[PDB]
Amino acid sequence: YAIKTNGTNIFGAMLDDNIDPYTIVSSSIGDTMELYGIEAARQKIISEIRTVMGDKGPNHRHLLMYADLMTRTGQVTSLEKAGLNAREPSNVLLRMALSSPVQVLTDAAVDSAVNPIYGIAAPTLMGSVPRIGTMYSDIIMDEKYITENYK
C-alpha cells in the first residue's frame, strides 16, 4: 500500500519521517525539477507524456525526443514561443515563422542578430530546401573513377 495525494510538496514529504524519502514520485514537473535536478525532470516529463498518450501511445523514442529537447538547456523549457527563445535565440526566422513576426523582427533588427541557416523553418523562409535526409550528405562526382573507368 502507498499514499496518492492531491497537491505536491516533495520537500515536506522528504522531511517527514513516517514516509520513504527516496521514493517520492510527484506528478508536477516543476517540483520534480526543482528538488531533483534536470535529469529527474526529464524522466518525469517522459512519464507524464506517456501517461497522457495512454495505451495507444507512440514509441518511447518520441517521448524521449520531447523530454530531451525540452530539457537540453538544464531547465525545463516549454514548447511555446518562450521555450523557442530559450533554446534557439539566434534563429530569428524560426521564431518569426512560429508567431508574432513583427515583434521578433524588430528585436532582431535592433539586436543585429546573425541568424545561421539550419533546421527546417530558417531555410524555408529564405526560399531554400533544408539540409535533411536526401540532402544531408554532399554528393561529389568521382574524379578518378570517371577518369580511369569512364569517358
Joined together, the cell numbers standing for residue 58 give 507512440
What is the phi-psi region of residue 100: left when phi exceeds 0, alpha when psi lies from -120 to 50, beta otherwise?
left
For residue 29, the minimal CB distance to other proteins (Å) is: 12
Angle between helix 38-53 and 60-70 (nearest 10): 140
For residue 132, the minimal CB distance to other proteins (Å) is: 5
Half-sphere exposure of 80 (CA within 13 A, CB side): 3
Reference 106, options 96, 94, 116; nearest CA is 96
For residue 114, the minimal CB distance to other proteins (Å) is: 5
For residue 67, the minimal CB distance to other proteins (Å) is: 10
Nearer to other proteins, 30 or 62 (CB): 62
Cβ proximity of 48 and 27 under 8 Å: yes
Nearer to other proteins, 8 or 10 (CB): 10
Cβ proximity of 70 and 78 under 8 Å: yes
**Residue 25 to residue 67: CA distance in whole angstroms:** 17
For residue 35, the minimal CB distance to other proteins (Å) is: 5
